[PDB]
Copies of this chain bind each other. A is one copy, B any other.
Amino acid sequence: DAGLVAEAEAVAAGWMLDFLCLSLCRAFRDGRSEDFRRTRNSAEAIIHGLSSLTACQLRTIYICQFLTRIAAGKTQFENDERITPLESALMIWGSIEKEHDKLHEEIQNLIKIQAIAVCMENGNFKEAEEVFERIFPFKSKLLMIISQKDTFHSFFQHFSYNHMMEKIKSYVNYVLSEKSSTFLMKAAAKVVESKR
């Protein structure tokens, strides 16, 4: 019966999804770019094998999508979405992990500023202004900074790329702890500990 076989494949896809999310979180925290890139490709492919997702599975795929956009922050996509990777992460973030309001607002604001600053860092001030117009007295100060190419303004040092990465890594630690007990990781660790 391919009903029973199809159901077992859906159960296994769900397990593979959690395993790849946990692996993606670890690679992001560790700074292992090539590993992150490979795990991301695997998660994206496995996600195609699922056509119906539970509330928990939706949150999992969106954390994977959010981290993928954060990792591409300083890098076709702009032709399709007409926005920068960090603007996409901001849109994804706006619908996930809202219940920790304090840290959610902190991460949101760091991404908003960095979506502008990464364009300035790359020498594209016209793009930095286009990003500002899509996201946003406070605005007049931010516009003057972009106009004057004031990349190292004190505001940008408090709302830095490193600070954005640090806050996101602290959030990643909660996801990594929450998913550390998923089926495939526990079974994988039991085999490694037995050898050993």
Q: Tell me if A2 counts as interface (CB < 8 A to partner B).
A: yes
CB A10 to nearest CB in B, in angstroms, measures: 8
In A4-31, which residues have CB < 8 Å from any B CB?
Answer: 4-5, 7-9, 11-12, 15-16, 19, 23, 26, 30
What chain B residues lie within 8 Å of A185 (beta carbons)? 8, 12
- The 9 A-B pairs of least Cβ separation, nearest first, read A8-B188, A45-B45, A42-B45, A12-B188, A11-B188, A7-B192, A41-B45, A8-B189, A38-B48
Report whether A4 and B192 are in contact in the complex, using a CB–CB cutoff of 8 Å.
Answer: yes
Number of interface residues of A (CB under 8 A): 32
Residues of A contacting B: mostly = helix
Q: Tell me if A144 counts as interface (CB < 8 A to partner B).
A: no
A185–B183 alpha-carbon span in the complex (Å)? 13
In A36-60, which residues have CB < 8 Å from any B CB?
Answer: 38-39, 41-42, 44-46, 48-49
Produce 1/0 per residue, A84-98, CB < 8 A to B. 000000000000000
Q: Tell me if A145 counts as interface (CB < 8 A to partner B).
A: no
Q: Tell me if A71 counts as interface (CB < 8 A to partner B).
A: no
Q: Tell me if A184 counts as interface (CB < 8 A to partner B).
A: yes
What chain B residues lie within 8 Å of A191 (beta carbons)? 8, 11
Find the B residue at minimum CB distance from A16.
B16
CB A61 to nearest CB in B, in angstroms, measures: 15
In A172-192, which residues have CB < 8 Å from any B CB?
Answer: 183-185, 187-189, 191-192
A55–B50 alpha-carbon span in the complex (Å)? 31
A7–B190 alpha-carbon span in the complex (Å)? 11
Produce 1/0 per residue, A64-76, CB < 8 A to B. 0000000000000
